[PDB]
Design a protein around this ligand. Structure first.
Ligand SMILES: [Mg+2]
Ligand SMILES: [Mg+2]
Ligand SMILES: [Mg+2]
Ligand SMILES: [Mg+2]
Ligand SMILES: [Mg+2]
Ligand SMILES: [Mg+2]
Ligand SMILES: [Mg+2]
Ligand SMILES: [Mg+2]
Ligand SMILES: [Mg+2]
Ligand SMILES: [Mg+2]
Ligand SMILES: [Mg+2]
Ligand SMILES: [Mg+2]
Ligand SMILES: [Mg+2]
Ligand SMILES: [Mg+2]
Ligand SMILES: [Mg+2]
Ligand SMILES: [Mg+2]
Ligand SMILES: [Mg+2]
Ligand SMILES: [Mg+2]
Ligand SMILES: [Mg+2]
Ligand SMILES: [Mg+2]
Ligand SMILES: [Mg+2]
Ligand SMILES: [Mg+2]
Ligand SMILES: [Mg+2]
Ligand SMILES: [Mg+2]
Ligand SMILES: [Mg+2]
Ligand SMILES: [Mg+2]
Ligand SMILES: [Mg+2]
Ligand SMILES: [Mg+2]
Ligand SMILES: [Mg+2]
Ligand SMILES: [Mg+2]
Ligand SMILES: [Mg+2]
Ligand SMILES: [Mg+2]
Ligand SMILES: [Mg+2]
Ligand SMILES: [Mg+2]
Ligand SMILES: [Mg+2]
Ligand SMILES: [Mg+2]
Ligand SMILES: [Mg+2]
Ligand SMILES: [Mg+2]
Ligand SMILES: [Mg+2]
Ligand SMILES: [Mg+2]
Ligand SMILES: [Mg+2]
Ligand SMILES: [Mg+2]
Ligand SMILES: [Mg+2]
Ligand SMILES: [Mg+2]
Ligand SMILES: [Mg+2]
Ligand SMILES: [Mg+2]
Ligand SMILES: [Mg+2]
Ligand SMILES: [Mg+2]
Ligand SMILES: [Mg+2]
Lengths: 188, 124, 155, 260
RNA sequence: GCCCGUCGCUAGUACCGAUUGAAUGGCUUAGUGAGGCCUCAGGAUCUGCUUAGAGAAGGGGGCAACUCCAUCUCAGAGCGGAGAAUUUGGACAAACUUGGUCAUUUAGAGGAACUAAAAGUCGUAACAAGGUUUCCGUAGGUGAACCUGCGGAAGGAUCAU
RNA sequence: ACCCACUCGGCACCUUACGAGAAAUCAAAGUCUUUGGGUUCUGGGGGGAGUAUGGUCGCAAGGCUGAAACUUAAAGGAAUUG
RNA sequence: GCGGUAAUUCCAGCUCCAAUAGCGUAUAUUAAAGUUGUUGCAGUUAAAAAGCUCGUAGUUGAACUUUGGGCCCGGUUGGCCGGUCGGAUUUCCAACGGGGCCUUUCCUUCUGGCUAACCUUGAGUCCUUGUGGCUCUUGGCGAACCAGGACUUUUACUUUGAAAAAAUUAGAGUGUUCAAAGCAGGCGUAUUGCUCGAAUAUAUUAGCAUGGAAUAAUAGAAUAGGACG
RNA sequence: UAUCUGGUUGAUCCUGCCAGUAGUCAUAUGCUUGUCUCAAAGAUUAAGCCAUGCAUGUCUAAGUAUAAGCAAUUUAUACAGUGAAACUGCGAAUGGCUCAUUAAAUCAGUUAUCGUUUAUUUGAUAGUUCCUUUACUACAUGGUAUAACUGUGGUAAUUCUAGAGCUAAUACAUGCUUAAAAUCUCGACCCUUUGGAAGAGAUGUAUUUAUUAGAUAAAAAAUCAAUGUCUUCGGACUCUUUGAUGAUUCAUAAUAACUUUUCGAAUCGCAUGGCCUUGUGCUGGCGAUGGUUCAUUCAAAUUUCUGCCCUAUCAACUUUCGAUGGUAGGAUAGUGGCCUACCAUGGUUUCAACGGGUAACGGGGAAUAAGGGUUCGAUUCCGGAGAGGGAGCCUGAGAAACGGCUACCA
RNA sequence: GAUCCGUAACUUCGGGAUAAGGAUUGGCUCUAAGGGUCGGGUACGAUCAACUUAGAACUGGUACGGACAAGGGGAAUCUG
């Protein structure tokens, strides 16, 4: 199988190293999940000492959390627009960590307009109190708010789908959002 | 897979193979105490040789050294016990000297004769 | 090494789990995290004052120093954010009852809280494996320039 | 080598067992348990080589299966069960009790104790942590884990234990001038009161020790076990009280009583 | 007296050498590529969930209306699971073919050394001013030792006008 | 220019030898079994042989580096008497 | 080196020698070998100083920087005594070591926690005419190391110690009938148990810990871009 | 336990080797051989090839018995004694053997995990599982589908097995449940304050992500946005809680969610007793096997410092097709060029790299005794590697296993 | 053909050499690097015009210097 040993691989002097012993099961590697979008398909893998790992292939939804807003929602994953490791991951809409995706915003909209009584873009007695006690801090942010019109939000994948079988992440904000916004248009 | 059974050889052999003086000196010792072997002389000389070595090394140490006092006295008290070492010279500068016959004289071979009971070393 | 550009990479560089809320307007624009390495090594000001990132930094980063602490003199600064040091020592050959000059080169990471040049004596301490070679991190500088400004022009 | 080693060759066996070279190939391999391999004393050694109660090993199984011997209050049917330092061995038949405790030579001594002393033990807390649901626990040298200990209890402090229940009835802090049993090194078995401790951040704290002949010596902290207050232990000490006479002194003593 | 070389006999060892010579061993290009594993498909059969019918059962509690849970049995329909042969693409990669490379060996007409070796043939080179002092370096020449030219050394046959 | 005395540094000779060496002899070849100031280089019985082989320098002649198998009880140095 | 006709070496007989349940031979290795030389070789003529000088790596490298004097404390041998029922400690003496002081004298350093020790003394005194002697709290020791902050020119060498498998080695104890071994065993009421053991040493380079500050390096303050506050 | 002797000459003193001499846990061979104890032994050459037999299996009162088995007695008409076969569980990764490869590898002493996995032993550890929450969910306990067996068969041939008919579980596959409390979100209403409220849902553990708490370097203040407890309604907040390490984003906890939802006992043996409202109600003794999380123990994997034999007739080597470092990912139990993508041009060397040789496994150690040394270690212990040669993999806690499988080569 | 890799004896050091021996090559769709010109007080902006070279996806009955075009190579002897 794939071997993770250093026993191949010339020494720092550049010297060629003879074969000592054989491939051991414990220095083993395995093949990439190369997980894609839609129609959930997950295969467990038996790892060292019992211990399942969940190799995802084809995930359609994940759990994405708005950091500044202190909430998390489950949304469809629309697509992959940016990846720092390799472009082919984006071309093929492959889900891995640090991938920049686009998700839903309809669940994130619903909660907001319910929580702040505001409605991004462009009656009950108790609710009125809450909304009034709130806002002043309903100000969101420019680059994040203008995205709801699209009905899609930029977010970064914080999980490892070929490992946990989860594709999870966080909405892009602030400086970090700025960074990927620039990258997006200055290549497009 | 067992612990090795340890062993050692009890004799040493003279380098100069033919030395007429040593040979004569050897035969007499045998002919006296009634030994069948030159090895029975060789053995004693080897035992004596290791004793003198221990003694030698102990002497190089400072007087009243803990190792020297302990081990030195033991050597002395062992030697005295069997009757090789005289009571008068107990301090191990004489164990450095000693000599072969002092050991030979203590063999049950000889004691049985020295006491009568035999009236020959060979009858012994 | 670094030398500005900060965000220069393809991936956005950030300290993990250190979060600055955009709703709340702060004056430093970035919340920075750092620790003290231990064993009485001063965590240099440039690490706290700095804008750099370096997840391999013993003061600002995700590694930890434990095990051997060694010193050596800097024989190369060429590779970015890592150096190579020579450690001399004399090896005893009993038969001749004398010694011979020997040396080893030890590759070690250097945070850009430090400005290192060749010739400086430097103190390093052991790491989890950082790279293929580097097993150590630079934790203090015992030299400075080795008298660089004393090389100056005519009187 | 593909997995756990299940055998122990003689001569690879810890020396303080005092087994003989010949008369066999292997030695009993201490089972997994409360104490580390190299520092334990399996029941088969104790019921045979120490107490001479059995001849065969096959008879040591015979004795055990009848639930005679019991360790720290429970029955312990394991032939190779790893009984360690501070443990309490009890024969209800013969009405005998035992606490495993070291020699001056660094060996486990045959040591008879009272009926009531056999109802408690001591252990050194090797760590104290915060467990799940916020419940703090301590762990002692024999592998006991005890929930809800005293907040003042810290690492290296010895602890007195009920044995009829898992509870701690008292504890002793690690301070200058506390009675100490040395477990480790070539000073193993000596008893010295703790002069002072060296710090050395980054590893292996040294601990300075003096018995009363007014003799001094040093071991690593890990090898120090606090047993009490000066002159007063919390358990009954074996004869010789860890004084370590010199080879001459022993020779003098042994030959001091020659009288028939 | 000693003694040098060519030339001749017997025996032995290593060398050079057409054969683009031979053998073993370790790596390896390029081409071909088994197998298990991962993966896109596949669906022998063999059932799950869901929807409706027809024939009986069991009652939440009523004089007629009203009505739940599990279980078996056949026309028919919506949305998933297992799963053999087979099969796509992959990493891993034995092995085969043809080459290259390194290491260790090795045959051979013939050529040309050395030794055993002391002697035999031809001469007399050295040792005596060895009968042309010897010897070094270089050069050319001669059956063979060796001769001769240029420049050295004395270890000369001269410590001396 | 020459004479006398001194003093540095020269090329050498004379007499001694405390000392050294197998001796011939040697103010170093001395201050070494009472064995250590610093440092460079070479040799390890005689032949085989400065040969074979590879590398390298050269126009060439050749230079530098440089083995082995096998053989053999001597080869050799200084001195004494013939 | 023997044997070519009286062979002290062959083939035997006789006799004799050496080792002896063992003794010969072949091959290797070690000692002899100061013929591999650190200890410890040799190089004029015996084997061996490069034709000559330059020269990097390597090895090596003059002298000088707290010495000298004063005071105190307590150790271990050995003497002359023995007080005592083989060993004992005081005072007299030397002798050889350890610690700490004051001499212009960093001991990293402040901020408290601590104090063991006297410049102390608050009383006096068991008792030899008294500085022989220690219990004893109210002005007045830092370092003895705790712990928090703030910082520290680098090495070599040496000391002591921790951490250290067993078997092997050296070696104590023990009469396996001796011995090579083994780790046993030794005492009784030998009718219902008593009991000593299973030591110690070596373990060297490196790493860790501690004492030393000679020897030998390293760094500093000269375009002052110095030092303290 | 600090020794020399023979051989160059006519004789002499040297130089110098050859020869002699002694030991070998050093092999072989020759001759000779009576007793006691002790007892190595197909390593060397061929990690060459193998006939035959044997070397791994395992049951307690306590998982599964309708043997058309035995035994019958002894209370047993569900079972109950003993017990083939088979299922289930566990072991077969230990042991034993060999020394081929291997030269910074292994190995040794010394380190590290704040860089991971760990069957087992030992000690701890679980009141939460259903559902728009009155006509209700099997809990006095839910589902089949199979071996052994019976019967019909195939093949020269094997520890080959096909078709048909049965039946078990601690196998397979499902699935109920239990106190109190508090904090959170919603909010029907009522009434305007300074605002408060009935009752509706959510909250075991594990998984994945984001956020937050986890103070301490010695002391005090003003103001904004929220919003906590106590009113003597201008206002105050007074005591306010802190674990470990040299060092952490540590242990631990809290918020919003996530999951083809981990675990939370449909199990077994002995005993059978209390207690009244007589329901075969409701309780209840000892200990077995399980079970998640943590600890412990047995381990494992990586890992720091320093240390190897001969060689220059090997001086430069390393990036072909990763060489040295950076960022991100992927993969792993996990660190790491372990792999990939992007970027850069690095890494080692006369203090000998790189290459070559080794009739090389490393070590504890062995032989030789003035000392310094020299030579040896296949081989009773430790570590490593292998199972004709390569590669690959299933099972599992643990194997890249060979008395396991698959393929190629021989 | 062309691009890339790789290339022995021997030598007058110029050669031998296209030595030998190998891989690749269509279509389509993208990415990157390579330039001109004008105003700047005594860092950049604005505009226009060119096929080259490398890298990456997709695609086909594995084809692609698709016709045309276009060296067989190696070891020796004699000989100039
Ligand atoms: Mg794949
Ligand atoms: Mg670089
Ligand atoms: Mg066991
Ligand atoms: Mg041919
Ligand atoms: Mg020759
Ligand atoms: Mg002549
Ligand atoms: Mg003549
Ligand atoms: Mg002449
Ligand atoms: Mg003279
Ligand atoms: Mg005769
Ligand atoms: Mg005769
Ligand atoms: Mg002999
Ligand atoms: Mg010396
Ligand atoms: Mg010599
Ligand atoms: Mg000459
Ligand atoms: Mg000469
Ligand atoms: Mg000269
Ligand atoms: Mg030269
Ligand atoms: Mg000097
Ligand atoms: Mg030491
Ligand atoms: Mg002669
Ligand atoms: Mg003669
Ligand atoms: Mg004559
Ligand atoms: Mg000889
Ligand atoms: Mg063999
Ligand atoms: Mg063997
Ligand atoms: Mg075989
Ligand atoms: Mg039955
Ligand atoms: Mg094994
Ligand atoms: Mg079924
Ligand atoms: Mg805290
Ligand atoms: Mg009842
Ligand atoms: Mg060179
Ligand atoms: Mg990287
Ligand atoms: Mg490069
Ligand atoms: Mg070399
Ligand atoms: Mg080998
Ligand atoms: Mg070995
Ligand atoms: Mg060896
Ligand atoms: Mg071998
Ligand atoms: Mg092969
Ligand atoms: Mg295998
Ligand atoms: Mg087999
Ligand atoms: Mg096996
Ligand atoms: Mg050609
Ligand atoms: Mg193409
Ligand atoms: Mg352009
Ligand atoms: Mg022709
Ligand atoms: Mg022509």
């Amino acid at each position: 199988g794939i071997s993770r040993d250093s026993r191949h691989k010339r020494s720092a002097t550049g010297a060629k190293r003879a074969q000592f012993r054989k491939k051991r099961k414990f220095e083993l590697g395995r093949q990439p999940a190369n997980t894609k979008i839609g129609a959930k398909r997950i295969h467990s893998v038996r790892t060292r000492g019992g211990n399942k790992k969940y190799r995802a292939l084809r995930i359609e939804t994940g759990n994405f959390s708005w950091a500044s807003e202190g909430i998390s929602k489950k949304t469809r994953i629309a697509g992959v627009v940016y990846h720092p490791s390799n472009n082919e991951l984006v071309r093929t809409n492959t889900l891995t960590k640090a991938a920049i995706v686009q998700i839903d915003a309809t669940p994130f909209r619903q909660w907001f307009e319910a929580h702040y009584g505001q409605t991004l873009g462009k009656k009950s007695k108790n609710a009125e109190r809450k909304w009034a006690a709130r806002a002043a801090s309903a100000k969101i942010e420019s680059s994040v708010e203008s995205q709801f019109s699209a009905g899609r939000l930029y977010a970064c994948i914080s999980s490892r789908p070929g490992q946990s079988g989860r594709c999870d992440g966080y909405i892009l904000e602030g400086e970090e959002l700025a960074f990927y916004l620039r990258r997006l248009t200055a290549k497009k | 897979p067992r612990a090795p059974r340890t062993y050692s050889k009890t004799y040493s052999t003279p380098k100069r193979p033919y030395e007429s003086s040593r040979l004569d000196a050897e035969l007499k010792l045998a002919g006296e105490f009634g030994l069948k072997n030159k090895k029975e002389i060789y053995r004693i000389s080897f035992q004596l040789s290791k004793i003198r070595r221990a003694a030698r090394d102990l002497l190089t140490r400072d007087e009243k050294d803990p190792k020297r006092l302990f081990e030195g006295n033991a050597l002395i008290r062992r030697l005295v016990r069997v009757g090789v070492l005289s009571e008068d010279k107990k301090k191990l500068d004489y164990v450095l000297a000693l000599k072969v016959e002092d050991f030979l004289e203590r063999r049950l071979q000889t004691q049985v004769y020295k006491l009568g009971l035999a009236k020959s070393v060979h009858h012994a | 090494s670094t030398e500005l550009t900060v965000q220069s990479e393809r991936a956005f560089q950030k300290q993990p789990h250190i979060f600055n809320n955009p709703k709340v307007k702060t004056s430093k624009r970035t919340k920075r995290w750092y620790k003290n390495a231990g064993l009485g090594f001063k965590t240099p000001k440039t690490a706290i004052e700095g804008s750099y990132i370096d997840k391999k930094c013993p003061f600002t980063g995700l590694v930890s120093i434990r095990g051997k602490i060694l010193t050596g003199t800097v024989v190369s600064t060429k590779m970015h954010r890592t150096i190579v040091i020579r450690r001399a020592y004399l090896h005893y050959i009993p038969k001749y009852n004398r010694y011979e000059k020997r040396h080893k080169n030890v590759p070690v990471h250097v945070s850009p809280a430090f400005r290192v040049q060749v010739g400086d004596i430097v103190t390093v301490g052991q790491c989890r494996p950082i790279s293929k070679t580097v097993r150590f991190n630079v934790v203090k500088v015992s030299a400075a320039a080795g008298k660089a400004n004393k090389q100056f022009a005519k009187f | 080598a593909r997995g756990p080693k299940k055998h122990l060759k003689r001569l690879a066996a810890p020396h303080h067992w005092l087994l003989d070279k010949l008369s066999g190939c292997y030695a009993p391999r201490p089972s997994a348990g409360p104490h580390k391999l190299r520092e334990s004393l399996p029941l088969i050694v104790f019921l045979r080589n120490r107490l001479k109660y059995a001849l065969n090993g096959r008879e040591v199984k015979a004795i055990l299966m009848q639930r005679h011997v019991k360790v720290d209050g429970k029955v312990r049917t394991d032939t190779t069960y790893p009984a360690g330092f501070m443990d309490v061995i009890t024969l209800d038949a013969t009405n005998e009790n035992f606490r495993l405790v070291y020699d001056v030579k660094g060996r486990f001594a045959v040591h008879r104790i009272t009926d009531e002393e056999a109802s408690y033990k001591l252990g050194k807390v090797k760590k104290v942590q915060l467990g799940k649901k916020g419940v703090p626990y301590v762990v002692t040298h024999d592998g006991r884990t005890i929930r809800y200990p005293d907040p003042n209890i810290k690492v290296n402090d010895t602890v007195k234990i009920d044995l009829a229940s898992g509870k701690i009835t008292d504890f002793i802090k690690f301070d200058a001038g506390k009675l100490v049993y040395v477990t480790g090194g070539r000073n193993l078995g000596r008893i010295g009161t703790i002069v002072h401790k060296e710090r050395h951040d980054g590893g292996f704290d040294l601990v300075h020790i003096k018995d009363s002949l007014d003799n001094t010596f040093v071991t690593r902290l890990n090898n120090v076990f606090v047993i009490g207050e000066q002159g007063k232990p919390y358990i009954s000490l074996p004869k010789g009280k860890g004084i370590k006479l010199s080879i001459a002194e022993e020779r003098d003593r042994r030959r001091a009583q020659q009288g028939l």
